[PDB]
Amino acid sequence: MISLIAALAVDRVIGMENAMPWNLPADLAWFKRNTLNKPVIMGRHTWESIGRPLPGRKNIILSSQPGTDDRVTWVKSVDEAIAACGDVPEIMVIGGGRVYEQFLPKAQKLYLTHIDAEVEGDTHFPDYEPDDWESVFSEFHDADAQNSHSYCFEILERR
Numbered sequence: 337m338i339s340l341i342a343a344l345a346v347d348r349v350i351g352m353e354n355a356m357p358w359n360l361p362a363d364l365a366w367f368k369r370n371t372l373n374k375p376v377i378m379g380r381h382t383w384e385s386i387g388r389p390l391p392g393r394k395n396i397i398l399s400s401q402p403g404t405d406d407r408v409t410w411v412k413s414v415d416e417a418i419a420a421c422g423d424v425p426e427i428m429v430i431g432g433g434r435v436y437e438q439f440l441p442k443a444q445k446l447y448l449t450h451i452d453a454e455v456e457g458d459t460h461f462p463d464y465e466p467d468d469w470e471s472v473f474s475e476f477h478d479a480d481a482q483n484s485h486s487y488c489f490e491i492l493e494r495r
């Protein structure tokens with residue numbers, strides 16, 4: 337199956353000038369927990385934003401142009417990205433905006449972090465149809481000394 341994982345600020349903002357302005361260690365821990373030992377698919381802009389391979393995961397990069405780093409796998413289409421994952425139980429799509437839009441129709445599961453932060457962004461998570469999805473898990477956290485915003489971890493499964 338195909339899953340998307342993302343962290344959304346107010347109004348579905350996910351990025352700004354190819355960066356994520358906030359700093360929520362608890363959410364990066366959740367990201368690692370839910371992606372470790374799975375293949376991760378990302379667009380080239382997100383690969384540049386991260387800046388290095390994510391350890392313990394097969395890193396698959398979508399780009400129309402030839403790859404520039406053999407520590408990761410480069411593919412030229414959505415179907416090639418899926419095939420390069422091989423036979424695994426769960427494929428994790430980790431963005432960004434343009435990649436989320438292409439894989440959302442194929443996804444069975446969404447791992448969403450809702451961050452109570454106002455951010456002026458240039459990239460958004462796609463505007464999906466709420467009736468298509470059932471919330472099967474939600475866990476709210478107040479801000480603390482390490483995490484400056486409150487946040488909610490939610491998992492949604494396609495009905």
Ligand SMILES: NC(=O)c1ccc[n+]([C@@H]2O[C@H](COP(=O)([O-])OP(=O)(O)OC[C@H]3O[C@@H](n4cnc5c(N)ncnc54)[C@H](OP(=O)(O)O)[C@@H]3O)[C@@H](O)[C@H]2O)c1
Nearest residue numbers: 342343351354355379380381382399400431432433434435
């Ligand atoms: N908060 C979050 O959860 C989260 C997660 C991920 C990213 N982000 C943020 O999202 C932003 C980046 O998102 P973005 O929409 O600008 O870019 P993106 O989706 O990361 O990358 C888009 C690039 O991927 C390649 N691509 C996408 N689909 C393709 C296809 N079907 N075939 C071939 N190549 C394909 C193209 O590369 P080429 O131009 O080389 O062809 C395209 O320019 C950054 O701000 C990042 O920080 C946020």
Ligand SMILES: Nc1nc(=O)c2nc(CNc3ccc(C(=O)N[C@@H](CCC(=O)O)C(=O)O)cc3)cnc2[nH]1
Nearest residue numbers: 341342343363364365367368386390391430431449
């Ligand atoms: N929920 C969620 N939060 C995010 O921050 C996020 N970020 C991306 C894309 N950007 C990034 C940027 C950095 C790292 C990163 O450094 N991850 C480490 C953190 C480990 C830790 O802090 O415990 C990793 O090994 O995964 C991952 C993705 C995609 N989906 C997301 N999904």
Ligand SMILES: [Mn+2]
Nearest residue numbers: 346347348454
């Ligand atoms: Mn507004």
Ligand SMILES: [Mn+2]
Nearest residue numbers: 413414415416
């Ligand atoms: Mn296709």
Ligand SMILES: [Mn+2]
Nearest residue numbers: 419422423424
């Ligand atoms: Mn197969």
Ligand SMILES: [Mn+2]
Nearest residue numbers: 452453485486
């Ligand atoms: Mn806040």
Ligand SMILES: [Mn+2]
Nearest residue numbers: 437462463464
């Ligand atoms: Mn749309």
